[PDB]
Structure 1
Amino acid sequence: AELVSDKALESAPTVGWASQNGFTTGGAAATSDNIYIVTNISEFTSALSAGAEAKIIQIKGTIDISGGTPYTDFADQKARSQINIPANTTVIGLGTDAKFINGSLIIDGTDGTNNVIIRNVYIQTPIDVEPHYEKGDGWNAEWDAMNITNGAHHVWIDHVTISDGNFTDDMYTTKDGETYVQHDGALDIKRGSDYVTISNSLIDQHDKTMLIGHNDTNSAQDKGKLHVTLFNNVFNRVTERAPRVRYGSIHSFNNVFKGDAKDPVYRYQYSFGIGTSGSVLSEGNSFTIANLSASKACKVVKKFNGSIFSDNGSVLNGSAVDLSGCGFSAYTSKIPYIYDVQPMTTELAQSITDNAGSGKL
């Protein structure tokens, strides 16, 4: 098909881990036969069947992963809603409304998948039709909006929006006397995945958001991997994990975090979660948290079994913050790429907010 957007051939920026130890070009080298325009789930999976061949898949309108048939149970949702994105693929949205609903985009390196670009698309978090009950935790949902796993590497997520959208948590029902949680994580990066860059994106209205590194049996294999760079993104009405990381090394700069500690649906808990062997370098980030005092600024970061966290130049509710005394160890590994961290002013925060998300490429 014809290439509508010339911007589709662009590779990841010089800044970011997705451009370290190799480049993330997606399907920039695709032949005309591997350039597609898809308007439904059938055309989407057909295009994806090109495998590792460089391919550019242009999304037009809303793609219903369920194909119009609601999932009847877990097995059904597992069998039909998880869409694998193969190596050397660029999934780019056309215009202002490229969207995915009722499913998950999976970047699974178990088959060697790498070099993937997901850009200018909106992904509504899936609703698990059959949450499983966990002894001591209650109902737990299984599916996320996007999952990077099993060693997938060199992934660039740009101008993407992930939101609970049409079904927010205040709409949850109850089953057997417990809140029937049907949303799981939003964006997960785990199991040895590496070299990822998340830019100009928006995650809006969601609880358990971004988990980098999962508590697995042989997690030591995550050591020295899961390097993720996040810049110019907006995390709005997100309860927690932006991200919560274990083993991975996160570089989060000039992002906007907006929430309310008394939000009636997505009550802000914290932004950065410092888990086992995880590290986070926060720079020039903007935190606008309603009902959060400057005296409790340390609440933007939460310590789990990890220790490494450093912040430089961030601001909370219009005033600069000093988190050096929050109880964490210094982030010392040197960032390998050149990057421009600007002072977090009211205007920068506004610009980031105005530009973040899908439909703004």
Structure 2
Amino acid sequence: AELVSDKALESAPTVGWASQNGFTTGGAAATSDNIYIVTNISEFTSALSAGAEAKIIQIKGTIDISGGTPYTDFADQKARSQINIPANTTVIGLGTDAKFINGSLIIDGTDGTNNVIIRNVYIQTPIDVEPHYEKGDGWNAEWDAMNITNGAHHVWIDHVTISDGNFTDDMYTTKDGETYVQHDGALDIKRGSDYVTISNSLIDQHDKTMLIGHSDSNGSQDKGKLHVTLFNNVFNRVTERAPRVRYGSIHSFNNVFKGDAKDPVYRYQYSFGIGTSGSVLSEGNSFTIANLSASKACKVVKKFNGSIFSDNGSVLNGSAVDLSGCGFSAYTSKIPYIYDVQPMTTELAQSITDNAGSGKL
């Protein structure tokens, strides 16, 4: 088919881990027969059957992963809603309304998947029709909006929006006296995945958001992996884990975090979660957290079992913040790529906010 997006052929920028030890070009080398315009789930799966062949899949409008058929139970949702994105694929949204609902985009490296670009699309977090119960933890949801797993590498997520959308957590019902949690994580990066760049994106209205490194006992696979760069993104109304990391090495700069410690639905807990053997280099970020005083500035970064965290030039509610006394050891690893941390001002924060997410490419 014809290429509608004049930015569809672009590869990841020189900045970011997705451009280290190889380039992330997605399906830029696709032949005309492998350039698609999909308008529904059937056409989407058809396009994806090209497998590891270079392909460009242009998304028009809303793609209902359920195909208009509600999931009857866990098994049904598991069998139909987890859409795998193969190697050398560029999924790019057309216009301002390219969207996915009722499902998860899975970048699974088991088959060797690598070199994937997901861009300019909105993904509404899926609703688990059959949460599982765990004594002492309550109800738990299984499905995320996007998952990068099993060694998948060289992935560029750009101008993507992930949000609970039309079903927010205040709408949860109660079952057996406990909140019937139907939302899982937003974006997961785990099991040896590596070389990822997340740019100009928006995560809006969600609880358990971005977990990088899913288990403390999975070091054999995650040690020295999970390098992720995040810049010019907006994390709005997100409860926790803007980036909670285990084993991975995170570079987060010029991102905008907006929340409220007293939000009625997505109460701000913290932004950076420093887990087992995890490391975060935070630079020139903007934290605007209502009901969070300067004296409690360390709340933006929470220690779990990790200890590596450094911040350079970030701000809290408009003023420079010092987080050097929050109890962490400095991030000493070198950043291999050249990058430019712009001084964070309210003007820059607004610019980033105005350009973040799908429909803004």
Instruction: Give TM-score scaled by structure 2 length.
Output: 0.99
Q: Classify 1:53/1:216 alpha carbon distance in 2 versus 1 (closer, same or farther; 3 Å).
A: farther
1:7 is paired with a residue of what secondary structure? coil
* Percentage of pairs with the same residue: 99
Q: CA deviation at 1:230?
A: 0.1
Ranges of 4+ aligned residues in structure 1 off by more than 6 Å: none
Is contact 2:191-2:218 (8 Å) kept?
A: no
Deviations 1:180-217 (A, max 9, x none): 00000000000000000000000000000000001164
RMSD over aligned Cα atoms: 0.6
Give distance in 2, aligned partners of 1:141 and 1:358: 25
The CA distance in 2 between the partners of 1:264 and 1:217, in whole Å, is 35
Shift of 1:277: 0.3
Local SS of the residue matching 2:347: helix
Instruction: Provide Cα deviations, 1:315-339, integer angstroms capped at 9, x if missing partner.
Output: 0001100100100000000100000
Alpha-carbon shift at residue 221 of structure 1 (Å): 1.9
Partners of 2:216 and 2:276 within 8 A in 1? no
Q: Is the 8 A contact 2:12 2:25 kept in 1?
A: yes
Q: CA deviation at 1:32?
A: 0.2
Determine if contact 2:216/2:246 at 8 Å carries over to the other structure: no
Summarize deviations over 1:256-276 as a string: whole Å, max 9, x none.
Answer: 000000000000000000000
State how far apart, in whole Å, the 2-side matches of 1:45 and 1:246 are.
Answer: 33
Shift of 1:218: 3.5
SS in 2 for 1:311: strand
Corresponding residue for 2:290? 290
Distance of aligned partners of 1:65 and 1:216 in 2 relative to their CA distance in 1, 3 Å threshold: farther
**Residues in 2 aligned to 1:21 and 1:133: alpha-carbon distance in whole angstroms:** 42
Contact 2:190–2:226, Cα closer than 8 Å, also in 1:
yes
Counterpart contact for 2:309–2:331, Cα < 8 Å: yes
Cα deviation per residue 1:138-166 (whole Å; 9 max; x = unaligned)? 00000000000000000000000000000
Aligned ranges 1:149-298 → 2 under 5 Å: 149-215=149-215, 217-298=217-298
Between the aligned partners of 1:220 and 1:287, the Cα distance in structure 2 is 34
Q: CA shift at 1:6, angstroms?
A: 2.2
Q: Distance in 2 between matches of 1:246 and 1:121?
A: 27
**Does residue 351 of structure 1 match 2:338?**
no
The residue that corresponds to 1:58 in the other structure is 58
SS at match of 1:228: strand
How many Å apart are 1:5 and its aligned residue? 1.1
Larger CA deviation: 211-220 vs 154-163? 211-220
CA distance in 2, matches of 1:201, 1:188: 15
2:120 match: 120
- Segment drifting more, 210-219 vs 193-202: 210-219
- Equivalents in 2 of 1:164, 1:6: separation in Å? 29
Unaligned ranges ≥5, structure 1? none
Offset at residue 219 of structure 1 (A): 2.5
